[PDB]
Amino acid sequence: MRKKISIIGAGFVGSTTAHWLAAKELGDIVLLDIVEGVPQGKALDLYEASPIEGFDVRVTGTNNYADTANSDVIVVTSGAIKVNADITRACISQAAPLSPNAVIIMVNNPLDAMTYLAAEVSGFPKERVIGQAGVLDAARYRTFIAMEAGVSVQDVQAMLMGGHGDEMVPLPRFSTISGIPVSEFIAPDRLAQIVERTRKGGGEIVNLLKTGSAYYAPAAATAQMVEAVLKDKKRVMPVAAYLTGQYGLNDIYFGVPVILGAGGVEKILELPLNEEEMALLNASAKAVRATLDTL
Amino acid sequence: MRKKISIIGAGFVGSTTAHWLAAKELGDIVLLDIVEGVPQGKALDLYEASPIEGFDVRVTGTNNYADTANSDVIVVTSGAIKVNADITRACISQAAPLSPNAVIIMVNNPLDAMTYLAAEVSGFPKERVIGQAGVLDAARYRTFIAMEAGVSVQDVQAMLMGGHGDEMVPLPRFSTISGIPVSEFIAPDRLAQIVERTRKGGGEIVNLLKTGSAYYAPAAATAQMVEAVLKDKKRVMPVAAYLTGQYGLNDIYFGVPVILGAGGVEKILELPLNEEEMALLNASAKAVRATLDTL
Amino acid sequence: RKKISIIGAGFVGSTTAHWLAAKELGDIVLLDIVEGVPQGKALDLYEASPIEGFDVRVTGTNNYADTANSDVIVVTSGAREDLIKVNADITRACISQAAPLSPNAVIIMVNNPLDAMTYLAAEVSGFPKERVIGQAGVLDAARYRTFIAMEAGVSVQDVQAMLMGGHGDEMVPLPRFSTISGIPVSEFIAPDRLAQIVERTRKGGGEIVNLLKTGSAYYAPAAATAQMVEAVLKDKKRVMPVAAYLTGQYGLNDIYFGVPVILGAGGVEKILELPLNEEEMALLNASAKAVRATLDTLKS
Amino acid sequence: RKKISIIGAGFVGSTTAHWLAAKELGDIVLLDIVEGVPQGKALDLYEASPIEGFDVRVTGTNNYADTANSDVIVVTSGAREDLIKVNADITRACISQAAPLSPNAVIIMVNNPLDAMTYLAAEVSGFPKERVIGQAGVLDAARYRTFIAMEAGVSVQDVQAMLMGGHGDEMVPLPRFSTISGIPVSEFIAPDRLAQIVERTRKGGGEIVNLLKTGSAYYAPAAATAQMVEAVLKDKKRVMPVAAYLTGQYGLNDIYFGVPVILGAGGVEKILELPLNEEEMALLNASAKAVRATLDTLKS
Numbered sequence A, B: 001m002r003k004k005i006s007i008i009g010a011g012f013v014g015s016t017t018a019h020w021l022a023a024k025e026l027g028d029i030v031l032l033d034i035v036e037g038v039p040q041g042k043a044l045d046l047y048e049a050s051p052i053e054g055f056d057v058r059v060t061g062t063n064n065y066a067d068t069a070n071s072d073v074i075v076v077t078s079g080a081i082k083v084n085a086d087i088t089r090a091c092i093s094q095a096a097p098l099s100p101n102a103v104i105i106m107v108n109n110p111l112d113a114m115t116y117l118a119a120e121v122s123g124f125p126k127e128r129v130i131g132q133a134g135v136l137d138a139a140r141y142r143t144f145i146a147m148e149a150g151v152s153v154q155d156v157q158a159m160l161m162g163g164h165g166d167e168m169v170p171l172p173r174f175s176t177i178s179g180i181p182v183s184e185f186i187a188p189d190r191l192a193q194i195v196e197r198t199r200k201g202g203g204e205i206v207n208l209l210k211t212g213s214a215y216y217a218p219a220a221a222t223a224q225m226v227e228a229v230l231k232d233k234k235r236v237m238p239v240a241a242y243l244t245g246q247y248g249l250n251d252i253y254f255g256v257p258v259i260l261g262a263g264g265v266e267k268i269l270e271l272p273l274n275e276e277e278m279a280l281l282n283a284s285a286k287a288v289r290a291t292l293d294t295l
Numbered sequence C, D: 001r002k003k004i005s006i007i008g009a010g011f012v013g014s015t016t017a018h019w020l021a022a023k024e025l026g027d028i029v030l031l032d033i034v035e036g037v038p039q040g041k042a043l044d045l046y047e048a049s050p051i052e053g054f055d056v057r058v059t060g061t062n063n064y065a066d067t068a069n070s071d072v073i074v075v076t077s078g079a080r081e082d083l084i085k086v087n088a089d090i091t092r093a094c095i096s097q098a099a100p101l102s103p104n105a106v107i108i109m110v111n112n113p114l115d116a117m118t119y120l121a122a123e124v125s126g127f128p129k130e131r132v133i134g135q136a137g138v139l140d141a142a143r144y145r146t147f148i149a150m151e152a153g154v155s156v157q158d159v160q161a162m163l164m165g166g167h168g169d170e171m172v173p174l175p176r177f178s179t180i181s182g183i184p185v186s187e188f189i190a191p192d193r194l195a196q197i198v199e200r201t202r203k204g205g206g207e208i209v210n211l212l213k214t215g216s217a218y219y220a221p222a223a224a225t226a227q228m229v230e231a232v233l234k235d236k237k238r239v240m241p242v243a244a245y246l247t248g249q250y251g252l253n254d255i256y257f258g259v260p261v262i263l264g265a266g267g268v269e270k271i272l273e274l275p276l277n278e279e280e281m282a283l284l285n286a287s288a289k290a291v292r293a294t295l296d297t298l299k300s
């Protein structure tokens, strides 16, 4: 049978994630929400786009968790700390039991903390509970680099760590264009400006939309992670993963480079960060730790 | 240089149309709106999804019509009769002059009437001013047929005419699955139910969403028409076109089968409709005519 | 990941790997009896993956053990009675070795004589008839659709058509069952012009052979084959003409014949029975006779 | 629509048409001196369009007039001094007839000896040097990236690499300029293991030749060529290694050499100058000497 993906939270990010996934014909999609009608309408609307696009994907909406049973992947985009903590706990507690073999991909903020909560509530192997944050952030960074350098976005690669904004750990040294260091194309001061724009990337969209936050890129990032699992592509990407010593961090979810596949986090990469980079990471880890304790 | 597409009205349908088009890497996209920040945010958000998806598309947002100059295609999705008439007149009067060689694709409702208005205000050759309505409606119909018959949406074809809802002219006789009449798969009573669900398709999504109307399918339909023009694919699809005698109708925009290409409507097909079908068409034409006169 | 084994790494088999690899549908194993040939073509295609962006393991081999547990087995190892016996021996050898290793696979035959070889494959494999099919109609319909699109001046994406039987004289054209966006093809193309198109379709394979001088078509044949593989792997429920085992449909029994079917994860999930008129049945009966004759030569 | 002419409908040329047709990038004209060959391959591929869903006019011809006004001209008509003279005469004939008909086109050479043949094409066409390039580095980097992905156990979509020079011994590998999602390849693969990969890359073309016994690689070479065509047609500004005319970069003058460039609608839009260390420059200089020798044999 076809793969099955359940998206919990049929808002901007969740519905847009269904759109990116449907276009890829990766599997049947179930959009769940607590609000009646909303997921049903968005799912049917997207389903009706299928004859036009040519993909055979069963997109259904629902308010009943039973419809998410036996999912291969569970995406959680239901978030609006306390508020999201209750929402996240409610979603995972009802979804996890019905899909014991699924890989959970958290999107709700505060991301690192919510992913940790999902791991606790689900009791799933740590490798199968991850969060999306770094793929989006690296995507904004890669976009800015391509724009500035005047090259194809298909030729820019970048790795970064930590969490959102001030918790983000930029790593320009670990970004290249067709294998060439970005420093060969962009000078230090301009690169520093791009790093700052990346840190503020989410807020930049918020300040523009006025009524909500970003969704096209966040959903694309999430969909790419879902694809990595379903097709066991073994993508090397920054993801919120559970650490057991890497970078000197224990008992915490933190954005780190991993090889993402059908088994979820199949490997946590260990970068040879210099002292400057480690200082940024330590400060981030402390802030992420603070949010974790509050949780 | 790359093709250029301007989308006037950065709301649900317009932004979603940018999404479908960006994924196809069909050309640079300019999202224009009267509201500040909104088009800029949605465009940048989508642009930031490009390194993830791998398409090189310049997606920009704006409030200045000058940025839409020299567009190959102009999509109008700014509508909310009087209200939309003023909005449509304002959009076409400012956009048409800057892109004299563009094909205008209207989406604003009342569709047939607004497309007629766009033709008047723009003064463009009639073949280059069309409206999207039938592709969406036929898509819902094709979706329902595929669902019911249990076959791939890639194998269902369908033609229909007229306008939305009561103005829609269904033509089950002109729908097939891999060349086979749909009547071979679905009985008369069930087919009649599918036709009715198609007529009410837009309202069905509205009643579910509660706060707005459909956009995934409407945008997909619009994007497919944009693709047909940019790539001169010569698609055979129902489109709102200016009639000069076809089906006995003159001086009016009506949903009819056409061959859509780089020159816009490259041919209006003349179906051998029986008396039953012509009765439906005549009633529709009268209703569309009524809306036109009011306009 | 899904696994597809392509037996016979010649033009059709390798080109089929190309179409499938681009779709990132699953791991692909190309097998041949000739050493180096499959390994070279597989590696070549695998080396194109970073350029195209697909993650598919494409490997070549001479060992049937590497095709074990495949979801789909494509047979393109084929090379009058002479033609039949030669391909019967190759098909026999291929199926008897591959089938036992992939008991749950759907076998898609391509070797000619198509209908007869598919029958032999069902016979040798012992597989349920629904999981042993042949590719022929998708290619023939593709040529017909191409000619129609060319002539009518419309996108190939808006032309669909159904046909039955086998290759050439065994082909049962059905213009009545072809449309452009739901509109009969006869509305776009005159009778004489359409008859020529039907004739060109019957001789479509030969037309390519005569142009290439050496060898036959492979781009379209591989695309047709790949589309059937995708139909099974993604359980798309495609409505297409495929060589299937008949037990009464169209008045035919105990024979593989090109017929309209719903193709999904279970192989043939339904054999459609279109009501054909007197003229159309005349063509089908004459076609069935020719297919039956070939089948009898095989059983002898 | 955009128009691409592929001179030489052999394995690489036809496979390039296949990759391009699937991308629906523009009309494709396949030309060859042999009658029937291009017409057959073109028709075959055109007949696959309804199956795949792309609307591309694919035609075969023996008349250079049909390649008129092309946006891109791909040359894959090629067949020691013997090798050079034979290909020089073919390349000469192809360019002198095609270039005049498509004055604004970007010429992408594939024929070997690559660097030398691209130089000859610039010489014969009279085209601005930026619009006459050669494909070699994209393929070589593709093999290297494939081996790295295989070994590191990661997606081919996350491996990028740059290299220069020409084929085999003329290749200038640059492991320092290869990464996996921005992380140095050396962090994933040990020195000895990486050296083997570099060696396998140098001999990558030969490896395929030895396996096929007859003929050389075409899937990856065509994919590499097609990606360069797409770069021009869609003005993507790709950063890739291509054979370009040098006027001082890397200390080389009046010669075509594989170097990092930004490829767009204007052909070579920029030749990047990477600061290479002593060891790397040692490789490049020895490579330039070999390329220069080949060039001199050509000019003689």
Ligand SMILES: NC(=O)c1ccc[n+]([C@@H]2O[C@H](COP(=O)([O-])OP(=O)(O)OC[C@H]3O[C@@H](n4cnc5c(N)ncnc54)[C@H](O)[C@@H]3O)[C@@H](O)[C@H]2O)c1
Binding pocket: A008, A009, A010, A011, A012, A013, A014, A032, A033, A034, A035, A038, A077, A078, A079, A080, A084, A087, A090, A091, A106, A107, A108, A109, A111, A132, A133, A136, A212, A213, A214, A215, A218
């Ligand atoms: N990690 C990233 O990179 C990233 C990027 C953007 C947004 N986000 C976060 O993602 C979340 C969703 O953002 P959005 O813009 O889609 O929001 P939204 O408000 O549009 O959608 C959230 C949806 O969740 C539903 N919901 C609430 N509680 C639920 C419950 N218990 N069960 C099921 N559904 C429930 C709502 O009814 C709503 O439709 C937020 O927490 C946001 O901060 C993360």
Ligand SMILES: NC(=O)c1ccc[n+]([C@@H]2O[C@H](COP(=O)([O-])OP(=O)(O)OC[C@H]3O[C@@H](n4cnc5c(N)ncnc54)[C@H](O)[C@@H]3O)[C@@H](O)[C@H]2O)c1
Binding pocket: B008, B009, B010, B011, B012, B013, B014, B032, B033, B034, B035, B038, B077, B078, B079, B080, B084, B087, B090, B091, B106, B107, B108, B109, B111, B132, B133, B136, B212, B213, B214, B215, B218
């Ligand atoms: N033809 C079909 O099949 C079909 C299907 C669905 C919706 N529609 C119609 O499409 C239109 C858009 O629907 P929507 O859901 O995207 O709406 P929406 O309200 O989300 O978006 C419309 C956007 O237009 C902008 N706008 C208003 N006046 C403008 C002006 N003068 N210039 C530039 N921008 C302006 C708004 O500020 C808004 O962002 C409506 O008229 C709707 O009825 C047609």
Ligand SMILES: NC(=O)c1ccc[n+]([C@@H]2O[C@H](COP(=O)([O-])OP(=O)(O)OC[C@H]3O[C@@H](n4cnc5c(N)ncnc54)[C@H](O)[C@@H]3O)[C@@H](O)[C@H]2O)c1
Binding pocket: C007, C008, C009, C010, C011, C012, C013, C031, C032, C033, C034, C037, C076, C077, C078, C079, C087, C090, C093, C094, C109, C110, C111, C112, C114, C135, C136, C139, C215, C216, C217, C218, C221
């Ligand atoms: N529409 C159709 O159904 C259709 C269309 C085209 C071609 N065909 C048929 O498909 C077959 C292949 O055509 P081709 O052009 O690719 O041929 P080909 O000669 O290029 O390739 C056949 C390959 O099979 C291999 N082979 C032979 N015996 C084998 C065995 N016992 N096991 C494994 N491999 C073996 C060969 O060594 C060779 O590489 C032919 O029978 C041809 O007539 C059918």
Ligand SMILES: NC(=O)c1ccc[n+]([C@@H]2O[C@H](COP(=O)([O-])OP(=O)(O)OC[C@H]3O[C@@H](n4cnc5c(N)ncnc54)[C@H](O)[C@@H]3O)[C@@H](O)[C@H]2O)c1
Binding pocket: D007, D008, D009, D010, D011, D012, D013, D031, D032, D033, D034, D037, D076, D077, D078, D079, D087, D090, D093, D094, D109, D110, D111, D112, D114, D135, D136, D139, D215, D216, D217, D218, D221
């Ligand atoms: N990385 C690279 O740059 C790379 C990779 C692989 C192969 N190649 C080279 O590409 C060339 C083609 O390789 P192939 O395997 O496709 O060869 P091939 O022999 O299959 O095809 C060459 C085609 O050129 C045609 N031809 C000959 N002279 C011609 C002329 N004057 N005009 C038009 N057509 C003519 C032939 O008839 C033949 O169909 C060779 O020179 C080969 O060494 C380069």
Ligand SMILES: [Cl-]
Binding pocket: A110, A111, A112, A113, A114, A163, A288, A291, A292
């Ligand atoms: Cl956090």
Ligand SMILES: [Cl-]
Binding pocket: B110, B111, B112, B113, B114, B163, B288, B291, B292
């Ligand atoms: Cl109206």
Ligand SMILES: [Cl-]
Binding pocket: B184, C271, C272, C273, C274
């Ligand atoms: Cl039936």
Ligand SMILES: [Cl-]
Binding pocket: A184, D271, D272, D273, D274
């Ligand atoms: Cl530089």
Ligand code: NA
Binding pocket: A001, A002, A003, A004, A025, A026, A027, A028, C234
């Ligand atoms: Na699936």
Ligand code: NA
Binding pocket: A164, A165, A166, A167
């Ligand atoms: Na913060």
Ligand code: NA
Binding pocket: none
């Ligand atoms: Na400073």
Ligand code: NA
Binding pocket: B001, B002, B003, B004, B025, B026, B027, B028, D234
């Ligand atoms: Na373009």
Ligand code: NA
Binding pocket: A012, A016, B012, B016
């Ligand atoms: Na939206």
Ligand code: NA
Binding pocket: A016, A019, B016, B019
């Ligand atoms: Na969307």
Ligand code: NA
Binding pocket: B164, B165, B166, B167
């Ligand atoms: Na109405």
Ligand code: NA
Binding pocket: none
């Ligand atoms: Na009744």
